[PDB]
Amino acid sequence: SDGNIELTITGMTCASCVHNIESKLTRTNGITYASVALATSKALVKFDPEIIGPRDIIKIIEEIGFHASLAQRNPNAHHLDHKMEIKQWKKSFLCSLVFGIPVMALMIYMLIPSNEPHQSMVLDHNIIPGLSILNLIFFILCTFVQLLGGWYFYVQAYKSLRHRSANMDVLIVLATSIAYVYSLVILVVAVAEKAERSPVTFFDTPPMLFVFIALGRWLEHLAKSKTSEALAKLMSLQATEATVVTLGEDNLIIREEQVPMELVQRGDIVKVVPGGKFPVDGKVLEGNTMADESLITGEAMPVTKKPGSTVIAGSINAHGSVLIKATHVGNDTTLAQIVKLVEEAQMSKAPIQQLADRFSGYFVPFIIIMSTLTLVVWIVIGFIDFGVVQRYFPNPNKHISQTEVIIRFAFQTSITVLCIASPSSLGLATPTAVMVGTGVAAQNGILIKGGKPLEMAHKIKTVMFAKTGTITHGVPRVMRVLLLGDVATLPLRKVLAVVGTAEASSEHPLGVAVTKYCKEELGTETLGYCTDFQAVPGCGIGCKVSNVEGILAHFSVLIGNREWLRRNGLTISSDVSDAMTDHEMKGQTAILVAIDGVLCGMIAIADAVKQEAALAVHTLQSMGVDVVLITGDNRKTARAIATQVGINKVFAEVLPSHKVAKVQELQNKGKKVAMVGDGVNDSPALAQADMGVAIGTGTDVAIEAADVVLIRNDLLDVVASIHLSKRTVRRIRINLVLALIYNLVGIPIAAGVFMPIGIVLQPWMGSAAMAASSVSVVLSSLQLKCYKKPDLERYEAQAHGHMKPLTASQVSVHIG
Ligand SMILES: [Cu+2]
User: First and final CA of the chain: distance in angstroms?
Assistant: First the structure.
């Protein structure tokens, strides 16, 4: 509602454009947030609707020099498939190969001394003083390479220079231009003065420069294309053709028609043949079959479906033909939500990437200044203190002046210094790692969103769990119905009917179960009439009930906890106080029923704790994070469920009114708190907390309050979410370390500091060491794909030996 616009940008290649655009839009008044992702090439800027409009944003962006447009809906694979870049770089490398092989052959022919040479290396035979035939060949071929292979770099550098920015191709164009002009000048000088010896020229590096540059830029796109595998596979899974059928009266198909997805709407009925994908979500009408969503949620066992159940678009039918009633069509399909969440996850950049952008925005000028300083200091030391350099240049050759060797060495070390820096290794250190991590998470059911929770996941000290929906299954079952008052005037059928018709009014999870039990075991599907239904959450419900003879032919309602009776002026006896005590010790909550001020009896409610609840909490405790439990039920149930799980401190009797203060009090110490709720029920608590985990949410992954979503209703994915996130955060540090050692070692080696040792690099040897740098960063990120999902026997393997039992004695509770 605040003009949250997302723009797609075409032509953004380097890692400094992100910083440039971010700063340019941030410094403009009316805009406070600016995040654009290099990998997705999409921007996310929020602006005030009244001050400026999207037209101003697009004109500003096109003033910067990049084509911008509104984000599309259907087509997204061509941005991340990298096909165009791969084809272009393959063509460029193959084109440049024809001019690099002859240079390599000529260079190597000078290298090996022949045992019996035909004329003992006469390929440097002079024809006109100052110019050898080898130098003529090098000059001509390098001129052709420069006028043919450097066109793209020249164009890109010219486009970048139109603005105040400095980019990567500036380094390449500077290196090539200097290595060309210096050699051309020295050749002209030598030929003009009729020098007897042809000086050595830098006419061989650009042909060897471009081959390695193109090879590196092709291999790194090839490695990048493997980072977007998960998203591409998810996108290319939804069907397009729907077999819509028309039901006359008794599901009879009058005709068969084929309609595309963009035209089909809710309310239509579609038919699926065996081996065909489910096109749309909906409800199963008739027919029993099985379907697999291994590529949707990541499960392995093929689930069985029966009429009256739901389907997920993308799954493949196995047995027979089934007709379903379409409910979700288009962008609201679960797969579309998953795709949207994964795409938007690479938008909220962490601060570490912000520093990496600030440093990479000022890297090229730093390299240029270092190169100029190196050249100047080498000239100064040559023409001031000749002793240091002659100690390592001890051969005075009559064919070359002593100034000439100093000038050549200075220029060589000032070229290879700026031809060895790799800003790309800095730029794509974080995006590749985070995107591979998010993809491999999404392939396993975990749906981590946003880049901030990635490095936020490293520093949780305590994690918060909610009782219902997360530890327990969520489907309560009644154990037994107990009666305390009169039996004649209050028969079991009467109380069953009145409780059922009173609980039918509300939508409480236990109310549905108790109504189903009453209706089933009583034998009638009818119900009475309810009025004046008071609904106070966390306390109880009271109502007036009429028409009780419709069920008994085969009234003040007070339902709530212990304090509910006390609130309405009802006493609680000592004998009844000992009735629910035994049930609540077994983790079974109880409901008191009282009609007309009479102690009618007791109702038992039991919820089964999941088996995975034992391992996930203990693995987290072993990992080094605290855990606590919060619930709105009584004290005794919280203690009972905690022991069956292994959590010491609990927060019981929490009203659904405040429900946020416990988050604050854990954050008063300064630590970070993450709560594992269920979704729409605990939205205020999740969003306030640093990391909200919405577990057990099927086909409802469109949650804005939480930042970690789990599709499968499995508690082990909570452990796997942090486990996979830590292994992802470590890759940024490793990638950046490899992105700093390379530059801080590559400069001094190319700065000529290692002349006493005797290691000097030719400029072409400085780019072959650059192609190996960019690829090594991406291949390091691709190693995360070698991740096998752990299973139950894997987790319990390291858990053997240390399973400490705990009792209710060592179980703390809240303080007021
Ligand atoms: Cu370069």
Answer: 40
Going from the Cα of 150 to the center of ligand 1, the distance in angstroms, rounded, reads: 12
Residues 126 and 132: their CA atoms lie apart, in Å, by 4
Residue 242: name the closest of 260, 227, 226, 254 by CA: 260
Other CB atoms within 10 A of residue 452 CB? 16
Nearest CA among 10, 448, 426, 453 for reference residue 230 = 448
326 membership: H or E segment, kind and range: strand 322-326
Report CA(26)–ligand 1 centroid distance (Å): 30
Q: Which of 3.30.70.100, 3.30.750.24, 3.40.50.150, 3.90.1150.10 is the CATH number of 4-71?
A: 3.30.70.100
After which residues is the backbone of the chain broken at C–N > 2.5 Å?
554
For the domain spanning 239-332, the CATH number is 2.70.150.10
Residues in the chain, how many?
816
For this entry, resolution in Å reads 3.8
Round to whole Å and give the CA distance between 175 and 153. 12
**Cβ-based burial of 454 (10 A; exposed 0-12, middle 13-18, buried ≥19):** buried
The separation between CA 589 and the C-alpha centre of its own chain, rounded to angstroms, equals 40
What is the Cα Rg of the chain in Å? 37
Method by which this entry was solved: cryo-EM
Q: Determine the distance separating the centroid of ligand 1 and the alpha carbon of 176, expressed in angstroms.
A: 10
443: which 2 tokens?
A: 């392939």
- Sketch the domain layout of the chain as residue ranges: 4-71, 83-114+123-234+337-445+715-786, 239-332, 477-606
Level-2 CATH architecture, domain 477-606: 3-Layer(aba) Sandwich (3.40)
Q: 778 alpha carbon to ligand 1 midpoint, in Å?
A: 18
CA of 423 to the centre of ligand 1 (A): 8
12 CA distance to ligand 1 middle (Å): 17
Q: Are 417 and 747 in contact (CB under 8 A)?
A: yes
Two structure tokens written together for 306: 């029966």
State how far the Cα of 736 lies from the Cα of 730, in Å rounded to an integer: 10
- Residues with Cβ within 8 Å of 49's Cβ and at least 6 positions away in sequence, in order, are 2, 3
Q: DSSP code of 196?
A: S
| CB contact set of 804 (below 8 Å; sequence gap of 6+) | none
Q: Which of 434, 280, 425 is nearest to 344 (CA)?
A: 434
Please, which residues have CB less than 5 A from ligand 1, an ion? Answer: 171-172
Residue 773 sits at φ, ψ, to 5 deg, of -85, -50
Q: How far away, in angstroms, is 758 Cα from ligand 1 center? A: 25
Query: Is residue 522 within 8 Å of residue 547, measured between CB atoms?
Result: no
Nearest alpha carbon to residue 593 among 543, 640, 548: 543
Query: In this structure, what token pair is assigned to residue 689?
Result: 């907390």
Do 239-332 and 4-71 have the same topology in CATH?
A: no
For residue 419, report the distance from its CA to the centre of ligand 1, in Å.
Answer: 5
What strands lie across the sheet with 588-595, from one edge to the other? 477-483, 598-606, 588-595, 556-560, 540-546, 529-536
Pick from 706, 783, 726: nearest CA to 345: 706
CB contact at 8 A, 315 and 277: yes
- Residue 245: count of CB within 10 angstroms of its CB: 18
Amino acid symbol at 466: A
752 alpha carbon to ligand 1 midpoint, in Å? 19
